[PDB]
Design a protein around this ligand. Structure first.
Ligand SMILES: Cc1nc(N(C)C(=O)Cc2ccc(-c3ccccn3)cc2)sc1S(N)(=O)=O
Ligand SMILES: [Zn+2]
Lengths: 336, 719, 382
DNA sequence: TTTTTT
């Protein structure tokens, strides 16, 4: 819900053998250079001088870096003014740009390359809603993230830079931005398939294999202008007929239910099937007790499949230990 | 015609590497001497066995099933010296089919036959002695000693049998002026390892790691006793291992002789051993010796191919993949119900599950009275002996054990496991007929009538006739026998030409001649005959056989008695033939087989020719006191329905239509990938649940190794 | 002195008949039938070779030499695709008259013509070592061959069938494994068996299917058959031999251009493929991308270079309409240049242009009190 | 759970 103001990257470095600190600090300077180039590329109307723009570095405790598993790093960058980044996917894209920009600078790969077993450094899955990231100045229940100072080459205030790593705002995703006239919100960077490889492969797929029409267009054939409950109505009868033949030990449970539209992806429409009031729908699989079984939710999933035919699936979400808790499972998919 | 192009031009670098790998001379001291294999025979236990390096080379040809790795093997065979082998008899026959479809390939046997595996080795204690590897880093000598200690009860017997056989052979010819190239031809029946150093093992992932060293070891054996010209040239074996590393696994079974608990653990296959061992990846230099075939040809679906890519390469499972595989999920009670998906092979993850489903299918096909498959009952017997189960009970430290409790688990270990534990059968009733000093047991196994069954073991087919439609030198004789059983005047106008009221139904002479010359004399005649009359006026089966048959019920009434091939079950004629009655222990049961008429089951091949086959007999010999003795011989039929099977066995052969029954909790993504990849088209695929949506134990360790191989400049990728 | 390499197959077991021929025994000797032959003279440019070969294979029919040393062979292995059995000189007028007749038409060579012309100085020398090995083995030239024939027949036949392993397979086998077309049946049988290893070159290491594909793209003009005999109307070797000998892919320009065209096609193909694989290997080695995007690149690149349409254009660019190398209609192939133009040069460039190509940015501008509003609303409180 | 070699 909130807007992200700091580029916080989790660098998980793999090691072939222990490393000297000086090599790590030089590699971090190269990383600063590459990341600042990537930032000045992503945010074109900003002014990132890559000799004074402060990047902040933290290393996990494992001098001799006694690292047998990994050099835990966290890199924090202020989002340059007047930009603010919005969206989990937008920061995912920022992370991919930074990651594929740091493995372009010859200095970084020359310095740390002989040590990193896998060149992947940045994890991009810590930006989804509800996913946690270990803050700096904190440990793990084995390594308290403590700052490693890579001073900008032309930093005009060293003491400020050092006493900038201790301010929580510098390492918080949705921190207060540190008299705003204009503000530019980067809220989308295309998506997962904007890579040239992805955009070329998708285009070749259409040329060689064929066009897979989108969900909306396919649904439009069956007089649905997204209304989806309109088709879900008639679909309920077929689904109930299927269950009261193949899954009969809970038959008289979905005789009277109302499709409740819950999730809407452009290729996945999930409508909940709550009845009329709190009588839960017994989980169709993994037979449980009287109360344990009646602790499940049911959904109907319309998608596009096969030779562009609308595929309707019955899905369940169970609150028991036997089934994956709060995970969506499928039971049957029927044609429409 | 353009399909072959990439393979044609990318196999050449492979060919231009195997040649130097095979023409690299070893130093004189590094060559394993004969005295080495003499000392191995002397050694009793595999503990004092000296650390001995056996040099070898490898070249790895890996890829998805449908990659085309077979084109590489084809090009290798016609250009290079090679001994083509196979990990399974089915794979060996598949390679023979695909090598004789281009040129001549000599009969392709299994690698086990090549290194001398015989009958008594089948049930041998292959995991007994221990080894604390003086390793990390593991020297190649230590790895080879581990693989020889693993197979001590096989390596020792092979060495003893080869050695104590005596010396002539090549030793003789080599001294022509003191011509070994012409030696394997003049002196025949010589082991095929004496004439080549390039050994191609196809589907080598079906072999455990213990075999790799073993093969190399055996190679040197057979080139030392015979003093082969390759041994004089100081050449070393190169093992071209062709197989899929992420669609194939090897399993080791050990039977505890008191608990009667046969256990099967997973093992490291040759491919995984070579890819994932730092010692072998350096000695064999897999970086400069690895070819990955990358293209899946039988995939006309983009999304299905993407799913195969993510599963094989270990890529992250995304929501889109879940939604795609969501369109295959059909209920548990829909797959298991025999009325649904007719003609679709059903895979389960348990042999008990298959035994349940086949019985249910038979119940359905009997109650609903389907004349398509008239379910029938056929006897299968077993023959235990009193002395065997007396002495073995004595040696197991427990002399109290019932015979039925003996057959509680050894029924699987008494014959081919696959069909033995995947068959619906009656209780193996036994009574004590000590006439030939035996305890006989007998039950019956229910099949279905007229189904595409497959032969499991090695059977001797005896073709009796041709049950094919009118469409259509000893084969020419059989065609003459067919003709021997061979508008109304207008097609008759051309029929009178055959003559030389149907004109063919006026006068005749015995259609099949006896001598070859007379057969050829009447051959061109009958060949032109059908072409002319049939042209004018083809669905009714032209049923013609050497002897009159009457299929009353299921048993036929042929009066006169005298594995890959997809046969069709027909019926159980008795018609005792001495051809199958090659019976010579074995004679004690031969007498009873004369007593009780052994039924010979009849099968119909792809062409339609009916063939009567022999039965199958298999021994159980395993013990704990190092006393391998012939306990029990199992006489049965050894046919498989090809309608239901296990996921693990599905790895071997591809299937047309597939419905997968997945047990939750036991979900392994490798099993899901293997099950889903047996069919070419994603259209004909149904599943119990979604393997991507359920909790699955993924083991992506070899996947990253292929990925790092796809990320190496010296690895040859062929598209 | 023109030297001919000839593949033959008698009516029945060719091994027994050939051995009886070598022993000068009139017991089993089916007239021999030659079906494929390569003629050469000890020596060249590509057009020099083409002129020499076009001179060798007389357009009217037969060869152009006066004396002929013919080395008959069988399908066997020593990896050589054939194996010689017996060598015959042809210097007399009657000898060459029989050879021209049997080489231009296909009429079988009677046992007399060969048997009176065995080069005993070399014929029995070819298999002399086999005689010695048989003597040594059975213990545990031509008189020796006869004696070993008498002593142990089974081992002699087994040795002459293990060596020359293929021997005679079947009349139908040749029509099966060497294409259904007459072009294949003549030209591919000549090259893959009697011309590949002798002339060396890359084609020595290419398989039968590859050579048949090369023959398929060797699309020289096709004149109709004077007798309109179809390639599938052949039953015995007397039909295959007659088809091949009176064919017009056997005694002239096409028979002279095929060996050179094999070399040309392979050279053009490897020029493009090797370039494409250099790019493939380099980009693969220096990609440094995520695992999924790596697989996407490797499959995308292999498609973008070796797709069915691109391949079809390339094979149409190497198809010939004439065997004369100086009058060839083959033209430069567009495979590698097109692949580099679209996918590879662009990927080398993206190797911060990558950001410009893959950014698709959406930055909404909010100026005024709405900026202050968006700040407090979507950022941790001050 | 788990096939395969004669
Ligand atoms: C438009 C297109 N068609 C493409 N073909 C022909 C293919 O993938 C063919 C294929 C498909 C699956 C596999 C496979 C096999 C085992 C495990 C994983 N995977 C291999 C090969 S690739 C593209 S692309 N790269 O442009 O989008
Ligand atoms: Zn549940």
């Amino acid at each position: 819900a909130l807007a992200i103001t700091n580029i916080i990257l989790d660098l998980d470095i793999a090691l072939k053998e222990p490393v000297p600190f000086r090599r790590l600090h030089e590699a971090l300077g190269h990383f600063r250079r590459g990341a600042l180039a990537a930032v000045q590329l992503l945010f074109p109307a900003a002014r990132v001088d890559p000799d004074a723009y402060p990047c902040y570095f933290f290393k996990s405790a494992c001098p001799v870096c006694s690292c047998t598993d990994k050099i835990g790093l966290r890199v924090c960058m202020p989002v340059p003014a007047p930009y603010v980044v919005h969206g989990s996917l937008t920061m995912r894209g920022v992370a991919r740009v930074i990651q594929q920009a740091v493995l372009l600078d010859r200095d970084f790969v020359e310095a740390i390359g002989s040590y990193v077993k896998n060149f992947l450094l940045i994890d991009t899955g810590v930006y989804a809603h509800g996913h946690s990231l270990r803050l700096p100045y904190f440990a793990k229940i084995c390594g308290r993230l403590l700052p490693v100072f890579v001073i900008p080459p032309a930093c005009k205030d060293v003491p400020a830079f050092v006493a900038a790593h201790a301010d929580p705002r510098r390492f918080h995703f949705h921190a207060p931005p540190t008299s705003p006239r204009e503000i530019r919100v980067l809220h989308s960077l295309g998506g997962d398939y904007v890579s040239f490889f992805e955009r070329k492969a998708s285009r070749n797929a259409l040329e060689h294999f064929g066009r897979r029409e989108t969900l909306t267009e396919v649904l439009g054939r069956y007089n649905v202008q997204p209304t989806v409950e309109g088709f879900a109505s008639e679909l309920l009868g077929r689904i109930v007929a299927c269950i009261e033949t193949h899954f009969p030990e809970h038959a008289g449970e979905y005789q009277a239910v109302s499709v409740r539209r819950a999730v809407s992806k452009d290729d996945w429409v999930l409508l909940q099937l709550v009845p009329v009031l709190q009588q839960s729908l017994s989980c169709l699989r993994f037979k449980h007790g009287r109360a344990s079984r009646a602790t499940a939710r049911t959904f109907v999933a319309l998608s596009v499949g096969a030779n562009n035919r609308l595929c309707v699936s019955l899905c369940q979400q169970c609150f028991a230990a036997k089934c994956d808790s709060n995970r969506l499972h499928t039971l049957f998919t029927i044609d429409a | 015609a353009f399909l072959n192009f990439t393979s044609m031009h990318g196999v050449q670098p492979i060919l231009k590497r195997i040649r130097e790998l095979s023409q690299q001379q070893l130093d004189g001291a590094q060559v394993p001497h004969l005295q080495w294999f003499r000392d191995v025979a002397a050694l009793e236990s595999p503990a004092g066995l000296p650390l001995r390096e056996f040099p070898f080379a490898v070249y790895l040809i890996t890829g998805n099933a449908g990659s085309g790795k077979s084109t590489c093997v084809q090009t290798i065979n016609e250009v290079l010296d090679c001994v083509v082998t196979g990990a399974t008899r089915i794979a060996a026959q598949n390679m023979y089919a695909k090598l004789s479809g281009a040129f001549l390939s000599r009969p392709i046997n299994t690698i086990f036959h090549e290194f001398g595996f015989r009958g008594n080795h089948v049930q041998a204690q292959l995991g007994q002695y221990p080894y604390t590897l003086t390793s990390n880093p593991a020297s190649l000598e230590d790895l080879q000693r581990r693989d020889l200690t693993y197979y001590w009860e096989v390596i020792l017997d092979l060495t003893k049998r080869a050695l104590a056989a005596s010396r002539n052979e090549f030793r003789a010819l080599a001294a022509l002026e003191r011509l070994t190239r012409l030696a394997p031809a003049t002196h025949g029946a010589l082991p095929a390892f004496t004439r080549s150093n390039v050994i191609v093992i196809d589907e080598a992932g079906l072999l455990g790691r213990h075999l790799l060293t073993a093969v190399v070891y055996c190679w040197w054996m057979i080139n030392a006793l015979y003093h082969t010209p390759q041994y004089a040239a100081r050449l070393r074996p190169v093992l071209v291992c062709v197989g899929s590393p992420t669609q194939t696994a090897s399993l080791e079974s050990t039977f505890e002789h008191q608990k009667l608990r046969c256990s099967v653990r997973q093992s490291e296959n040759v491919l995984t051993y070579l890819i994932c061992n730092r010692t072998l990846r350096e000695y064999a230099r897999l970086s400069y010796s690895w070819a990955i075939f990358i293209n899946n040809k039988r995939c006309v679906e983009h999304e299905f191919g993407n799913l195969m890519k993510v599963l094989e390469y270990g890529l992250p499972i995304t929501e889109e993949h879940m939604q795609f595989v969501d369109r295959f999920v059909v209920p548990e009670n829909y797959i298991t119900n025999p009325a649904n998906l007719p003609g679709w092979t059903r895979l389960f993850s348990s042999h008990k599950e298959v035994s349940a489903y086949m019985a249910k299918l038979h119940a359905y096909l009997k109650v609903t009275r389907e004349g398509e498959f008239v379910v029938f009952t056929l006897p299968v017997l077993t023959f235990v002996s009193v002395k065997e189960f007396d002495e073995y009970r004595r040696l197991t430290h427990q002399p109290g054990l019932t015979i039925e409790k003996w057959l509680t688990a050894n029924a699987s270990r008494i014959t081919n496991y696959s069909q033995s534990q995947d068959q619906d059968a009656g209780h193996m009733r036994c009574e004590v007929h000590s006439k030939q000093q035996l305890v006989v047991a007998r039950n019956d196994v229910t099949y279905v009538l007229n189904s595409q069954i497959a032969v499991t073991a090695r059977l001797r087919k005896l073709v009796f006739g041709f049950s094919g439609t009118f469409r259509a030198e000893f084969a020419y004789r059989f065609l003459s026998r067919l003709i021997f059983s061979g508008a109304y005047a207008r097609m008759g106008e051309l029929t009178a030409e055959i003559l030389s009221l149907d004109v063919f139904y006026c006068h005749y002479t015995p259609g099949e001649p006896e001598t070859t010359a007379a057969v050829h004399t009447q051959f061109a005649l009958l060949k032109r005959a059908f072409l002319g009359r049939f042209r004018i006026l083809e669905v009714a089966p032209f049923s013609t056989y050497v002897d009159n048959v009457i299929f009353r019920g299921c048993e036929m009434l042929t009066g006169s008695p005298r594995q890959t091939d997809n046969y069709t079950l027909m019926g159980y004629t008795y018609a005792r033939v001495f051809a199958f009655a090659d019976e010579l222990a074995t004679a004690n049961v031969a007498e009873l087989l004369e007593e009780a008429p052994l039924p010979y089951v009849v099968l119909r091949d792809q062409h339609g020719f009916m063939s009567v086959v022999n039965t199958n007999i298999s021994e159980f010999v395993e013990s704990i006191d190092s006393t391998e003795l012939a306990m029990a011989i199992n006489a049965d039929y050894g046919i498989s329905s090809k309608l239901a099977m296990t996921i693990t066995r599905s790895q071997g052969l591809s299937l047309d239509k597939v419905a997968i029954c997945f047990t939750p909790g036991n979900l392994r993504l490798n099993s899901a990938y293997v099950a889903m990849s047996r069919t070419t088209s994603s259209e004909f695929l149904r599943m119990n649940l979604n393997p991507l949506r359920e909790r699955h134990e993924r083991d992506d360790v070899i996947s990253e190794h292929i990925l790092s191989a796809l990320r190496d400049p010296n690895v040859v990728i062929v598209y | 002195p023109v030297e001919v390499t000839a593949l033959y197959a008698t009516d029945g077991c060719v091994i027994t008949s050939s051995i009886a021929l070598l022993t000068n025994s009139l017991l089993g000797a089916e007239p021999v039938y030659i079906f494929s032959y390569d003629a050469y003279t000890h020596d060249p440019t590509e057009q020099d070779r083409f002129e020499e070969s076009r001179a060798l294979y007389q357009a009217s029919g037969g060869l152009n030499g006066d004396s002929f040393r013919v080395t008959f062979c069988l399908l066997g292995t020593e990896r050589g695709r054939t194996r010689p059995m017996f060598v015959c000189r042809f210097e007399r007028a009657d000898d060459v008259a029989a050879l021209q007749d049997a080489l231009a038409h296909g009429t079988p060579l009677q046992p007399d013509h060969i048997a009176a012309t065995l080069d005993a100085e070399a014929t029995f020398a070819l298999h002399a070592n086999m005689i010695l090995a048989l003597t040594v083995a059975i213990n545990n030239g031509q008189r020796g061959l006869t004696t070993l024939y008498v002593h142990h027949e089974v081992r002699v036949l087994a040795a002459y069938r293990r060596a020359y392993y293929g021997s005679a397979q079947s009349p139908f086998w040749f029509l099966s494994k060497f294409g259904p077309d007459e072009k294949s049946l003549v030209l591919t049988t000549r090259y893959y068996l009697l011309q590949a290893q002798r002339l060396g070159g890359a084609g020595a290491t290419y398989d039968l299917q590859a050579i048949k594909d090369i023959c398929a793209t060797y699309a020289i003009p096709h004149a109709p058959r004077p007798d309109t005999v179809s390639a599938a109307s052949l039953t015995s070797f007397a039909a295959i031999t007659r088809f091949c000998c009176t064919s017009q892919y056997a005694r002239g320009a096409a028979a002279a251009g095929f060996p050179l065209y094999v070399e040309r096609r392979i050279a053009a193909d490897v020029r493009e493929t090797s370039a494409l694989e250099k790019f493939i290997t380099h980009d693969r080695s220096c990609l440094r991308v995520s695992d999924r995007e790596f697989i996407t690149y490797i499959y995308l690149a292999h498609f973008e270079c070796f797709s069915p349409p691109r391949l079809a254009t390339h094979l149409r660019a190497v198809t010939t309409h004439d065997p004369n190398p100086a009058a060839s209609t083959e033209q430069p192939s567009p495979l590698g240049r097109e692949a580099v133009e679209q996918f590879f040069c662009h990927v080398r460039a993206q190797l911060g242009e990558y950001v410009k190509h893959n950014v698709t940015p959406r930055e909404t501008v909010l100026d005024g009190d709405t900026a202050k509003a968006y700040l407090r609303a979507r950022t941790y409180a001050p």
